Design an enzyme around this catalytic site. Structure first.
Site, PDB file in Angstrom:
ATOM      1  N   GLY C 144       0.827  -1.186   0.000  1.00 18.35           N
ATOM      2  CA  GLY C 144       0.000   0.000   0.000  1.00 18.35           C
ATOM      3  C   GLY C 144       0.864   1.240   0.000  1.00 18.35           C
ATOM      4  O   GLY C 144       0.561   2.217  -0.690  1.00 18.35           O
ATOM      5  N   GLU C 254      29.929 -12.629  -1.744  1.00 16.16           N
ATOM      6  CA  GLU C 254      29.984 -14.031  -2.142  1.00 16.16           C
ATOM      7  C   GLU C 254      28.587 -14.588  -2.374  1.00 16.16           C
ATOM      8  O   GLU C 254      28.377 -15.387  -3.294  1.00 16.16           O
ATOM      9  CB  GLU C 254      30.720 -14.862  -1.089  1.00 16.16           C
ATOM     10  CG  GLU C 254      32.210 -14.566  -0.910  1.00 16.16           C
ATOM     11  CD  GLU C 254      32.503 -13.156  -0.430  1.00 16.16           C
ATOM     12  OE1 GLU C 254      31.569 -12.475   0.039  1.00 16.16           O
ATOM     13  OE2 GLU C 254      33.676 -12.736  -0.502  1.00 16.16           O
TER      14      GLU C 254
HETATM   15  N1  LIG Z   1       5.237  -7.338   6.235  1.00 17.04           N
HETATM   16  C1  LIG Z   1       4.071  -7.355   6.866  1.00 17.04           C
HETATM   17  N2  LIG Z   1       2.900  -7.507   6.158  1.00 17.04           N
HETATM   18  C2  LIG Z   1       1.717  -7.520   6.808  1.00 17.04           C
HETATM   19  C3  LIG Z   1       1.655  -7.378   8.189  1.00 17.04           C
HETATM   20  N3  LIG Z   1       0.337  -7.443   8.539  1.00 17.04           N
HETATM   21  C4  LIG Z   1      -0.402  -7.607   7.407  1.00 17.04           C
HETATM   22  N4  LIG Z   1       0.444  -7.650   6.327  1.00 17.04           N
HETATM   23  C5  LIG Z   1       0.135  -7.825   4.891  1.00 17.04           C
HETATM   24  O1  LIG Z   1       1.024  -7.017   4.138  1.00 17.04           O
HETATM   25  C6  LIG Z   1       0.337  -6.176   3.231  1.00 17.04           C
HETATM   26  C7  LIG Z   1       0.828  -4.748   3.424  1.00 17.04           C
HETATM   27  O2  LIG Z   1       0.835  -4.035   2.208  1.00 17.04           O
HETATM   28  P1  LIG Z   1       0.232  -2.543   2.191  1.00 17.04           P
HETATM   29  O3  LIG Z   1      -1.151  -2.616   2.787  1.00 17.04           O
HETATM   30  O4  LIG Z   1       0.185  -1.991   0.789  1.00 17.04           O
HETATM   31  O5  LIG Z   1       1.206  -1.688   3.150  1.00 17.04           O
HETATM   32  P2  LIG Z   1       1.661  -0.158   2.889  1.00 17.04           P
HETATM   33  O6  LIG Z   1       2.090   0.117   1.465  1.00 17.04           O
HETATM   34  O7  LIG Z   1       2.786   0.185   3.825  1.00 17.04           O
HETATM   35  O8  LIG Z   1       0.391   0.776   3.229  1.00 17.04           O
HETATM   36  P3  LIG Z   1      -0.904   0.302   4.060  1.00 17.04           P
HETATM   37  O9  LIG Z   1      -1.986  -0.129   3.100  1.00 17.04           O
HETATM   38  O10 LIG Z   1      -1.424   1.470   4.858  1.00 17.04           O
HETATM   39  O11 LIG Z   1      -0.535  -0.826   4.996  1.00 17.04           O
HETATM   40  C8  LIG Z   1      -1.146  -6.268   3.545  1.00 17.04           C
HETATM   41  O12 LIG Z   1      -1.874  -6.562   2.374  1.00 17.04           O
HETATM   42  C9  LIG Z   1      -1.281  -7.391   4.552  1.00 17.04           C
HETATM   43  O13 LIG Z   1      -1.974  -8.464   3.964  1.00 17.04           O
HETATM   44  C10 LIG Z   1       2.852  -7.224   8.905  1.00 17.04           C
HETATM   45  O14 LIG Z   1       2.899  -7.095  10.125  1.00 17.04           O
HETATM   46  N5  LIG Z   1       4.049  -7.214   8.229  1.00 17.04           N
HETATM   47  N1  LIG Z   2      41.611 -20.487   6.482  1.00 10.13           N
HETATM   48  C1  LIG Z   2      40.806 -21.471   6.088  1.00 10.13           C
HETATM   49  N2  LIG Z   2      40.577 -21.710   4.740  1.00 10.13           N
HETATM   50  C2  LIG Z   2      39.747 -22.715   4.352  1.00 10.13           C
HETATM   51  C3  LIG Z   2      39.132 -23.511   5.317  1.00 10.13           C
HETATM   52  N3  LIG Z   2      38.369 -24.434   4.701  1.00 10.13           N
HETATM   53  C4  LIG Z   2      38.489 -24.244   3.372  1.00 10.13           C
HETATM   54  N4  LIG Z   2      39.326 -23.190   3.127  1.00 10.13           N
HETATM   55  C5  LIG Z   2      39.645 -22.745   1.751  1.00 10.13           C
HETATM   56  O1  LIG Z   2      40.922 -22.164   1.559  1.00 10.13           O
HETATM   57  C6  LIG Z   2      40.811 -21.324   0.423  1.00 10.13           C
HETATM   58  C7  LIG Z   2      41.949 -20.315   0.344  1.00 10.13           C
HETATM   59  O2  LIG Z   2      41.715 -19.153   1.100  1.00 10.13           O
HETATM   60  P1  LIG Z   2      41.917 -17.740   0.365  1.00 10.13           P
HETATM   61  O3  LIG Z   2      42.815 -17.905  -0.835  1.00 10.13           O
HETATM   62  O4  LIG Z   2      42.497 -16.751   1.360  1.00 10.13           O
HETATM   63  O5  LIG Z   2      40.424 -17.351  -0.093  1.00 10.13           O
HETATM   64  P2  LIG Z   2      40.021 -15.865  -0.558  1.00 10.13           P
HETATM   65  O6  LIG Z   2      40.806 -15.448  -1.786  1.00 10.13           O
HETATM   66  O7  LIG Z   2      40.204 -14.891   0.581  1.00 10.13           O
HETATM   67  O8  LIG Z   2      38.463 -16.009  -0.937  1.00 10.13           O
HETATM   68  P3  LIG Z   2      37.665 -17.374  -0.622  1.00 10.13           P
HETATM   69  O9  LIG Z   2      38.209 -18.477  -1.497  1.00 10.13           O
HETATM   70  O10 LIG Z   2      36.194 -17.190  -0.921  1.00 10.13           O
HETATM   71  O11 LIG Z   2      37.847 -17.727   0.835  1.00 10.13           O
HETATM   72  C8  LIG Z   2      39.433 -20.693   0.514  1.00 10.13           C
HETATM   73  O12 LIG Z   2      38.900 -20.475  -0.769  1.00 10.13           O
HETATM   74  C9  LIG Z   2      38.617 -21.730   1.260  1.00 10.13           C
HETATM   75  O13 LIG Z   2      37.700 -22.339   0.384  1.00 10.13           O
HETATM   76  C10 LIG Z   2      39.363 -23.272   6.665  1.00 10.13           C
HETATM   77  O14 LIG Z   2      38.820 -23.971   7.517  1.00 10.13           O
HETATM   78  N5  LIG Z   2      40.198 -22.247   7.050  1.00 10.13           N
END
Ligand SMILES: Nc1nc2c(ncn2[C@@H]2O[C@H](COP(=O)(O)OP(=O)(O)OP(=O)(O)O)[C@@H](O)[C@H]2O)c(=O)[nH]1
Ligand SMILES: Nc1nc2c(ncn2[C@@H]2O[C@H](COP(=O)(O)OP(=O)(O)OP(=O)(O)O)[C@@H](O)[C@H]2O)c(=O)[nH]1
Ligand SMILES: Nc1nc2c(ncn2[C@@H]2O[C@H](COP(=O)(O)OP(=O)(O)OP(=O)(O)O)[C@@H](O)[C@H]2O)c(=O)[nH]1
EC number: 3.6.5.-
Lengths: 427, 74, 438, 427
Positions: C144, C254
């Protein structure tokens, strides 16, 4: 020097091996902690035949433990000497056997043979020169038959130059508990006779009878039965570890013991079995012991060779002994029953004298038998197998595992060859 | 009487609760593995002392075993 | 250094916005006055707040955000709330009219005379900050006041500042619940104006959030207080990387570089696994394996996307708390072997992991659980095109019979722009299927 | 005197270096405050190969710390040894990484390469004569690869007469976390091949398996991986700093290690690994070390070379050993697998024996390997690269940065040339 690597398999060998090893440790005087207490020089010199050395003066056993059910290992590990065995040495499986031979011969062994092969070759490299190896298992056991038949088949090709000692227990002839046991027995023995060179035959019923005869203690423990068979197995191994002019090598023995290649099945024998008052009512002398050595009651292996005749006999005497009393008692027995021998071979007696008495008694001996008393054994297993294959009872499992009736066809043909073979040579 | 729909602000489970609420409940202690563990096991802080302890550990036992050898030992 | 600026357009975006700093104050323990206890954290403004709050020598933590809306009713009430002393008086941008759920009215009528004012606000925040990684836009498609007014401002911040990131967070329109039939007007109007400038748009739907409440949190009649706290916990988890560290720290850069496949489509979906009641976690156990099953369990997502109807491209997980790489890498390995989870063959690897040792805390007077291991699961799949597919067949009829057009054309708009967004939407849907086709 | 100056690059090399330097200090016995406690003469004399002298007996490390993200540098600064590092050596940028190869290689590098070159040449002019340098980074790292490729290219021409040692960890084959990593890897390796002379290859999965296998500790930290590789890194560097009848120079090693210029990728190998009970269950003997250092499970770099063969093998032995056992293990392993080497070169083994053991372990070793076990590694990335380049995934950033598809064409082509070159040398 010649050393030995031990192989433990099957859930039976789980109990034999533990009992077998603790006897040796107590024989040599090592504490359960493992810190050997120096008391006998000779056992100090010749423990390396079976044990390697680690730090702290502990003698690491060179045995291999394999099974599937973890609880069994927990029990033996919590046993009196589990600390002496290595967690490195403990190989096992994530599964249960189901007491199934086919599962343990094709399915579960497949992913486990590699590790145990990698295991056993490691200690094979750790040691320099082996005479061979010995295996504790059972012919009627689920895991033992499935594992062993695979390993023995494999162990031949890598090392066809060593001894394939196999120590298997025969289940009770009257009762098998496991109903597929003859199927397990028939499958294994087909490879066993093909693969092994020596086999020990042991049965529980005789052990029960011997308890009735000489132990006289009503209610024993299965470990005491293990104490019996381990003592018999220990006695034949005392030859190698101990001095005295007796010729110890199993090759010194086996070639003297087997006439033809397919003869692998042998019957143990042991020395004074004693009851409550007879410890102080016995004059331990050569005549009475050799009498008791050759008692149809004193045997324990399968059943009486009285039904048949004696092919080859070998006797080892352990203790302060002399050649003259034994020489005459071979002459005594030879003249006693010459006809009950076979005319195929005269003087079929093999004698070894260990001058070192055992830990437990002075005068002792061990006997190993090759007589004509195995016919009814596999003759027995013949009828049930024919009966069971007559209407293929309990067969849908192994087919699902991938087994066919064809494997059984030659297998029984293999045993039936031995039936004729054993019959032909004697009768 | 609201037990039929006891939501008025929140649901109640207090009678089934025999303990408190103050903090969060960790399943077990991975630290227990950490005190059990020593990171520097490859290099224990036991310099020259353990050399002597292994030096006096029975060369004669080891010589009887497999003909031991330390530093030119016959 | 490492800081960002948050913005909240729409009274939908305000009370959800109010909650987060009500949450944000607790983990650092900010008292309602605006200062710490006698313990020392004030100075040149260099501590855990420096990324979020501006606690100068005066000792008052100034949040780095502006609350903008076209009516005072909600914002003057919170200007009489508990934290109004913290909030800068003219950071609570209020209007005096209503945009009447009109995209154009907010975008054209009143926006011209107000954006210059908030333009003054953003630059005066720009001069004081140092790192300025990007922006946090909390809004709504069927706003809304959120819908129309956001569009002009995001254009103005894009044209003057196109070298820094923009992060969009809006409630996606409820698919089967229609609180506004002008929402399909403004929502597609918002999308087409934002497709060519928005960098990363993250959505959410309240129905499943409500459906979450009674499935496992066991609340059959929750409130915004719960709902805002849930999403407030979400934004807290992703922002923990700026606050604290872990085994590895990953930045929104990631996120942008590794989540969006190609231009246009930049619409992943978030998910938080340990959404459980207090007593449930009380008598059960939590570990990475089961929450990994739940996070990928199809019913734990808040959009009506059935994943097996689509296919997976990118998936980001952020483990906050006590975890180890071992069971994490073993569990995700089982996920790769899974057959139901059908990733696209274009991506053999699609998992961006973030580890933070700090366990998420409970909130006083809250309904959450007592969590050690937590994860915010950001993922993108092809099962989302059905949402705009729902919109267009909704749209095509309501453009076929020119409903409520006299309202829009009576204030200065024409039909061409309404026409444009349709083939613009039609452009996206064919983009969605061709990337779906391997 | 020939010394080494170290560079820590990438965020991984930031953890690696922080672990690496404290290992050096604790090995040499300097307190965290920096005041050396005089205990060992040999480490006292040969500390200048890496460290320089500050006032008050403080040994300043010769390392330059470069990154973009402050928090990582603040953390290592706040470490137990952040004080022993220099704020002078803390060069960085006011930008975030984005884990983008090109931004660090062309955008972010442009304004930082000027400063880092000044620092290193000031460090170069601070010391007299280098052996070379060593680098700790990753090939798949977002920033480390970007500057690592930049720095190696620049530091080639100023001093093309030294050692270009590199230490890069290969990402996990099962999952790369970073999804554009194969692009970054293929980018990096294209510049790595011509600009490097030595490469270390490391994989965390194998390190994870090592924890399961011998560490048996379930839950380690990432730092629980770092001392593991640094010990290998320290071990190969012990040879220079310590006396003993072994030739230390990497040029001693590299010429014995590198038959052909394209052979830069070399794999680590480390010596006794021990479990919970095996500290007191291990007989510390040169054979079982040689056994264990040559274990299929003991390789930790990428995977098992069993699929391929061994080109060159070189192991350094640290502790109280003798010249004869290294020979007869060398003979044993030569006979153990004679065919598994390449017929191209016999006696492909290069052995070094450091007489000075670690400060608490005596029998130890370090192994550096060149086998035919790298093919699958870049084949794996080959299908990764081809499939993503098949439909140019994630390409708009690098074109937005200014990179073009042609750069990828020769990058894979060079890799394809490397594929055959490894193949045609062995197969
Ligand atoms: N995320 C969330 N959604 C809810 C909650 N309670 C009801 N809803 C649902 O989420 C929808 C909210 O969308 P809108 O009504 O457009 O909310 P808005 O754009 O902020 O404006 P209003 O109509 O005044 O609430 C409603 O249709 C409800 O069905 C809540 O506590 N959290
Ligand atoms: N230090 C550490 N490395 C781990 C472990 N298990 C797996 N690895 C692997 O070791 C690899 C080498 O680390 P880095 O070369 O420093 O990785 P990066 O370039 O920082 O980025 P990522 O590969 O996403 O971690 C990682 O890609 C991990 O997948 C662990 O328990 N400890
Ligand atoms: N350990 C043990 N084994 C016994 C005992 N009595 C009979 N056995 C037999 O010894 C056999 C050999 O054991 P294993 O080969 O290890 O048996 P398995 O392969 O684990 O499978 P199962 O035979 O079903 O137990 C068993 O099948 C039993 O039938 C006993 O008292 N103790």
């Amino acid at each position: 020097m010649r050393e030995i690597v031990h192989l433990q398999a099957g859930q039976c060998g789980n109990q034999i091996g533990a009992k077998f090893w603790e006897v040796i440790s107590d024989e040599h005087g090592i504490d359960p902690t493992g810190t050997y207490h120096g008391d006998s020089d000779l056992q100090l010199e010749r423990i390396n035949v079976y044990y390697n050395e680690a730090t702290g003066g502990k003698y690491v056993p060179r045995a291999v433990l394999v099974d599937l059910e973890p609880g069994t290992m927990d029990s033996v590990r919590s046993g009196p000497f589990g600390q002496i065995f290595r967690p490195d040495n403990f190989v096992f499986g994530q599964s249960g056997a189901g007491n199934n031979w086919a599962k343990g011969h094709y399915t579960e062994g497949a992913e486990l043979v590699d590790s145990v092969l990698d295991v056993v070759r490691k200690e094979a490299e750790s040691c320099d020169c082996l005479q061979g190896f010995q295996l504790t298992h059972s012919l009627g056991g689920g895991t033992g038959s499935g594992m062993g038949t695979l390993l023995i088949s494999k162990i031949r090709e890598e090392y066809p130059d060593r001894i394939m000692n196999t120590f298997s227990v025969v289940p009770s002839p009257k009762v098998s508990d496991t109903v597929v046991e003859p199927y397990n027995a028939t499958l294994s023995v087909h490879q066993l006779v093909e693969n092994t060179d020596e086999t020990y035959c042991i049965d529980n019923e005789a052990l029960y009878d011997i308890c009735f005869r000489t132990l006289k203690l009503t209610t024993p423990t299965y470990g005491d039965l293990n104490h019996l068979v381990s003592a018999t197995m220990s006695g034949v191994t005392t030859c190698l570890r101990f001095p005295g002019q007796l010729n110890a090598d199993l090759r010194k023995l086996a070639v003297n013991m087997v006439p033809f290649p397919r003869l692998h099945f042998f019957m143990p024998g042991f020395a004074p079995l004693t009851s409550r008052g007879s410890q102080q009512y016995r004059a331990l002398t050569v005549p009475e012991l050799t009498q008791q050595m050759f008692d149809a009651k004193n045997m324990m292996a399968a059943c009486d060779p009285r039904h048949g005749r004696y092919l080859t006999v070998a006797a080892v005497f352990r203790g302060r002994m002399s050649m003259k009393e034994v020489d005459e008692q071979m002459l005594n027995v030879q003249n006693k029953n010459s006809s009950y021998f076979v005319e195929w071979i005269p003087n079929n007696v093999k004698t070894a004298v260990c001058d070192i008495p055992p830990r437990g008694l002075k005068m002792s001996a061990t006997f190993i038998g090759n007589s004509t008393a195995i016919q009814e054994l596999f003759k027995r297993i013949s009828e049930q197998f024919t009966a069971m294959f007559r209407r293929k009872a309990f067969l849908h499992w192994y087919t699902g595992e991938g087994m066919d009736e064809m494997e059984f066809t030659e297998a029984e043909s293999n045993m039936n060859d031995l039936v004729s073979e054993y019959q032909q040579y004697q009768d | 009487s609201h037990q039929r729909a006891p939501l008025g602000k929140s649901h109640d489970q207090t009678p089934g609760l025999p303990k408190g609420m103050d903090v969060i409940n960790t399943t077990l202690g991975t630290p227990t593995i950490r005190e059990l563990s020593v990171r520097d096991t490859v290099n224990p802080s036991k310099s020259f002392e353990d050399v002597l302890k292994e030096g006096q550990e029975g060369h004669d036992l080891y010589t009887v075993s497999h003909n031991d050898y330390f530093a030119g030992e016959a | 250094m490492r800081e960002c600026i948050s913005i909240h357009v729409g009274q939908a975006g305000v009370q959800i916005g109010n909650a987060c700093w009500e949450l944000y104050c607790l983990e650092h323990g900010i008292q309602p006055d605006g200062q710490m206890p006698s313990d020392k954290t004030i100075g040149g403004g260099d501590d855990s707040f420096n990324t979020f709050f501006s606690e100068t020598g005066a000792g008052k933590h100034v949040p780095r955000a502006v609350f903008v809306d076209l009516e005072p009713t909600v914002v003057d009430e919170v200007r009489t709330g508990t934290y109004r002393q913290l909030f800068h008086p003219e950071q609570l941008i209020t209007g005096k009219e209503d945009a009447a759920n009109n995209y154009a009215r907010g975008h054209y009528t009143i926006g011209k005379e107000i954006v210059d004012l908030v333009l003054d606000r953003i630059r005066k925040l720009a001069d004081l900050c140092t790192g300025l990684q990007g922006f946090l836009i909390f809004h709504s498609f069927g706003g809304g006041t959120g819908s129309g007014f956001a569009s002009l401002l995001m254009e103005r911040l894009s044209v003057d500042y196109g070298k820094k990131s923009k992060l969009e967070f809006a409630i996606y329109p409820a698919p089967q619940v229609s609180t506004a039939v002008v929402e399909p007007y403004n929502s597609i109007l918002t999308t087409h104006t934002t497709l060519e400038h928005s960098d990363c748009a993250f959505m959410v739907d309240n129905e499943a959030i409500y459906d979450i409440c009674r499935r496992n949190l066991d609340i059959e009649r929750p409130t915004y207080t719960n709902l805002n706290r849930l999403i407030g916990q979400i934004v807290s988890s992703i922002t923990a990387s700026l606050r604290f560290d872990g085994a590895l720290n990953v930045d929104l850069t990631e996120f942008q570089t590794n989540l969006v496949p190609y231009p246009r489509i930049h619409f992943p979906l978030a998910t938080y696994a340990p959404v459980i009641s207090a007593e449930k976690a009380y008598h059960e156990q939590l570990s990475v394996a089961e929450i990994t099953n739940a996070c990928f369990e199809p019913a734990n997502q808040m959009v009506k996307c059935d994943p097996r109807h689509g296919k997976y491209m990118a998936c980001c997980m952020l483990y906050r708390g006590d975890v180890v790489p071992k069971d994490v890498n073993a569990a995700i390995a089982t996920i790769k072997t899974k057959r139901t989870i059908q990733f696209v063959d274009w991506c053999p690897t699609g998992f961006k992991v973030g580890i933070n040792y700090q366990p998420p805390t409970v909130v006083p007077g809250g309904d959450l659980a007592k969590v050690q291991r937590a994860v915010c699961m950001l993922s993108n799949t092809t099962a989302i095109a059905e949402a705009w597919a729902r919109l267009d067949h909704k749209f095509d009829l309501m453009y076929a019979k020119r409903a409520f057009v006299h309202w829009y054309v009576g204030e200065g708009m024409e039909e061409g722009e309404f026409s444009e967004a349709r083939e613009d939407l039609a452009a996206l849907e064919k983009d969605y299927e061709e990337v779906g086709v391997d």
